[PDB]
């Protein structure tokens, strides 16, 4: 509270570390469904069903232009990518499987990079 300073982690490397994690995501062989925005004019249903589209290129742009206030807002957008994918795709589909794989891949890197 007011003048009750809570000790907080060093956040000086967060931008660089998030960029590193995002690069590893971008280069994963299963990243292809997520590299660019879903084409809202070629994919029926997507615009109406998915209220907040997100993809790695949009995250990369926001990261590079200071649009994430903190690392938690970055993680929210990454997770949004995979939550959208689950919403729109069957688990037993290539894109569906790609999403689960990439979510697992992200969350381990997230834990390993920032949690202890
Ligand atoms: N091309 C695509 N079509 C439908 N859902 C997707 N989720 C990620 N990429 C997609």
UniProtKB/Swiss-Prot annotation:
Component of the BRF-1 ISWI chromatin remodeling complex, at least composed of SMARCA1 and BAZ2B, which regulates the spacing of histone octamers on the DNA template to facilitate access to DNA. Within the BRF-1 ISWI chromatin remodeling complex interacts with SMARCA1; the interaction is direct. Component of the BRF-5 ISWI chromatin remodeling complex, at least composed of SMARCA5/SNF2H and BAZ2B, which regulates the spacing of histone octamers on the DNA template to facilitate access to DNA. The lineage of its organism: Eukaryota, Metazoa, Chordata, Craniata, Vertebrata. This is Bromodomain adjacent to zinc finger domain protein 2B. Belongs to the WAL family. It comes from the Eukaryota. It is found in: Nucleus. The chain holds residues 2054 to 2167 of 2168 of the full protein. Residues 9-113 form the Bromo domain. Expressed at varying levels in several tissues, whereas a smaller transcript was expressed specifically in testis. Regulatory subunit of the ATP-dependent BRF-1 and BRF-5 ISWI chromatin remodeling complexes, which form ordered nucleosome arrays on chromatin and facilitate access to DNA during DNA-templated processes such as DNA replication, transcription, and repair. Both complexes regulate the spacing of nucleosomes along the chromatin and have the ability to slide mononucleosomes to the center of a DNA template. The BRF-1 ISWI chromatin remodeling complex has a lower ATP hydrolysis rate than the BRF-5 ISWI chromatin remodeling complex.
